[PDB]
Amino acid sequence: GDIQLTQSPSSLSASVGDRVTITCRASQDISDYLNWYQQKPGKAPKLLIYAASSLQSGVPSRFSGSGSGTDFTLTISNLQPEDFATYYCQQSYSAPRTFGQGTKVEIK
Amino acid sequence: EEQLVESGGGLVQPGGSLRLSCAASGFRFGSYYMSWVRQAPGKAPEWVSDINTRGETTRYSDSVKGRFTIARDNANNTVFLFMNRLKPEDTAVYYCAVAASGDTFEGRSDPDYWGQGTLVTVS
Amino acid sequence: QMQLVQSGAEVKKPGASVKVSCKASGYTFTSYAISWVRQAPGQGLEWMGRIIPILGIANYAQKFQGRVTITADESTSTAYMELSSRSEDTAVYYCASGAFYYGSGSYPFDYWGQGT
Amino acid sequence: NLCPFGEVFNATRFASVYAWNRKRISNCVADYSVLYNSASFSTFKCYGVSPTKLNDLCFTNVYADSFVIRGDEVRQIAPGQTGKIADYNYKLPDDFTGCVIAWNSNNLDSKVGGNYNYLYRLFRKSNLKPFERDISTEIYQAGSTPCNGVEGFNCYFPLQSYGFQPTNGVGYQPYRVVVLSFELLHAPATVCGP
């Protein structure tokens, strides 16, 4: 009944201006509804991309997002030190609201 | 479907004259009542005129009786109107209306499909 | 313009009651369908349920089926989550938000708590 | 007795179309002349009998409902008219005797734009009958595949709301609507004046 959510890969090592893509996955045909969040330690996880294919006001065109069906992709160009925090998956096909296991990117 | 968007108004001087027009589509013209209505600031919409389903017989409100008239156009899918000797108190947004009765009773039957809205100021 | 107050840290023995505050001020109220999200230190987020002040329809997740309660008040504009449980579930107390639109998106959008 | 339409019309708060109200009035008189000739109500539409003869013609018990409806869909209150608020909110008997009165009042409930205090249900099983409501605020079954029982997708939450901007186009001002239904029973007539 309840969907299971996974986030891969678990830990990423990166430098200035690298390439990183989050491989999120589930066990159901998620048509369009999925969200992503950014977690530095000490705050509530702020939004990065809503609806998995749209850009939220207050976020520049630095971040990108698309995907349909089961496989989803996440893109950030020209990474910055303020982007180095823990990531989250957030599907919204149905209930219960499932959450990612976290993905931390830390500077070499 | 039954779109009502009106045009032909705006700013005008005292004693001026404006020609409004709302172009509707998707339905016939001859058999349907389509009145002109006004809405001042402070709401309370007030009817001014109403063309017949026939050619040109029309009843006007007493403030505009003998002053303002309507014009019928079956083929052009639009309704025209005419003012002479404007007053500064005639400032209101103008809409067209849709049919009435339907072989039923009277009692100031209120049409539903009205226009987008055109502001008219006499100054 | 909007924030929810941070309740002070406390150490509760197992079986003791817990009171929390989630102020809902600012903007036009009755805008977001209020929810609540839990996490453990070193572990991910988990979701419990949803409260709407317009209706009050109950929502509860699998790990808290008939265990934790949801109450709220429009006039004080505060969410309330009470529980009589053990001491191993203590962590930061994040009160969720987000508008559950009709025929549109139902995401927890923004405007959560910065602490307990 | 004098029949209290003042404590009907000069009330301050009105219901919503999913939770429309009733009230029955009995043993009173008929004084509809002030309602006709006050000219503060824009609409007076109804069928069958003519208003010039309701100050003597009378029945045994009358009924009344008071709630607010979108003005762009005022034809949807009719005996046998299509629509959606003519599908899931308020139905009328086919052989209609009573009468419906409406007007525009966008000054008291002309609040800050996007205010959505009044709602309307969009999805409900099949059809409606007159003279019953729907208090079933439960999430309806669009789930041919059973999603949760709780709100998700392949299933919807059908209770959407209105919007009242003081500069909206034409169809979203809060027109209040009352209906005064006439019905005849075995009992002798009670409610009329002179």
Query: CA C1, CA C23: separation in Å to the nearest integer?
Result: 12
C55: contact with D, CB 8 A cutoff:
yes
Cβ neighbours of A46 in C, within 8 Å: 110
> Which residues fall within 8 angstroms of residue B113, CB to CB, at 6 or more apart?
B2, B4, B97, B98, D72
CA dist., res. C98 & res. C61, Å (int): 17
**Strand order through the sheet with C22-23:** C22-23, C78-82, C69-73
Count up the domains in chain B and report the number. Answer: 1
- How many Å is the maximal CA-CA distance in chain C? 44
C58 interfacial to chain D (CB closer than 8 Å): no
Task: Report CB contact under 8 Å: C113, A88.
Answer: no
Residues of A in contact with D150 (CB under 8 A): 95
CB atoms within 10 A of CB A37: 21
For chain A, domains (ranges, CATH) are 5-104 (2.60.40.10)
**Is the minimum CB–CB distance between B117 and chain D shorter than 8 Å?**
yes
- Domains of chain C (ranges plus CATH)? 16-96 (2.60.40.10)
DSSP state of D83: S
Where are any strands of DSSP class E within chain D?
23-25, 43-45, 61-70, 99-104, 119-121, 159-161, 174-183
Q: Which of A35, D151, A11 is nearest to C45 (CA)?
A: A35
Q: Rounded CA gap, D146 and D144, in Å?
A: 6
Which structure tokens are listed for B107? 């009692």
Are A43 and C62 a contacting pair at CB < 8 A?
Answer: no
**Contact residues for B6 (Cβ-Cβ < 8 A; gap 6+):** B20, B21, B22, B94, B95, B96, B115, B116, B117, B118
Solved with = cryo-EM
D and C touching (3 or more beta-carbon pairs closer than 8 Å): yes
Tokens 């893509």 appear where? A21
Residue C72 CB neighbour total at 10 angstroms = 17
Two tokens at B36? 């002109």
Select from A38, A99, A43 the least CA-distant residue to A74. Answer: A38
Both tokens assigned to A6: 């996974």
What DSSP line would sit under D38-52, residue for residue?
T---SEEE--SS-GG
Residue B93 amino acid letter:
V
Neighbours of A91 (CB within 10 A): 20
Assigned token pair, D29: 């008189």
End-to-end CA distance of chain A: 41
Residue where the block lists tokens 């989803």: A72
Confirm or reject contact between B44 and chain D (CB < 8 A).
yes
Our separate counts of H helices and E strands in chain D read: 3, 7
Interchain proximity A2–C62, CB inside 8 Å: yes
Chains B and A touch (3+ CB pairs under 8 A): no
Judge whether D156 is closer than 8 Å to chain C, CB to CB.
yes
Compute the CA torsion angle C11, C13, C17, C19 (nearest 10 deg).
10
Residue D37: helix, strand or coil by DSSP? helix
- Show the CA angle centred on residue D148, arms to residues D146 and D149, nearest 5°: 90
Domain hosting B55: range is 3-122
Report the candidate in D119, D126, D156, D121 with the shortest Cα–Cα distance to residue D141: D156
D153–chain A Cβ distance below 8 A for any pair: yes
CA neighbor of B15 nearest in space, from B119, B117, B90, B118: B90
Task: For residues A39 and D124, give the distance between their C-alpha atoms in angstroms, rounded to a whole number.
Answer: 42
C111: buried, middle or exposed (CB in 10 Å: 19+, 13-18, 0-12)?
buried
A3 touches chain D (CB under 8 A): no
Name chain A's partners: 3 or more CB pairs within 8 A.
C, D
What's the CATH code of the domain at B114?
2.60.40.10
**C-beta separation of B14 from B122 below 8 A:** yes
Resolution of this deposited model, Å: 4.4
DSSP chain A: -----EEE-SEEEE-TT-----EEE-SS-B-S-EEEEEE-TTS--EEEEETTTEE-TTS-TTEEEEEEBTEEEEEESS--GGG-SEEEEEE-SSSS------EEEEE-
What string of DSSP letters covers B20-55?
-EEE--SS-STT---EEEEEETTEEEEEEEEE-SSS
Task: Report how far apart, in Å, the C-alpha atoms of D67 and of each of B23, C59, D34, D82, D118 are.
Answer: 34, 30, 21, 20, 10
Q: Where are the beta strands (DSSP E) in D51-158?
A: 61-70, 99-104, 119-121
The answer to whether C55 contacts D137, with C-beta atoms less than 8 Å apart, is yes
**Residue numbers followed by a gap, chain D, C–N over 2.5 Å:** none
Q: Give the CA-trace dihedral at A55, A58, A63, A69, to 10 degrees.
A: -30
Contact B109 D171 (CB under 8 A): no
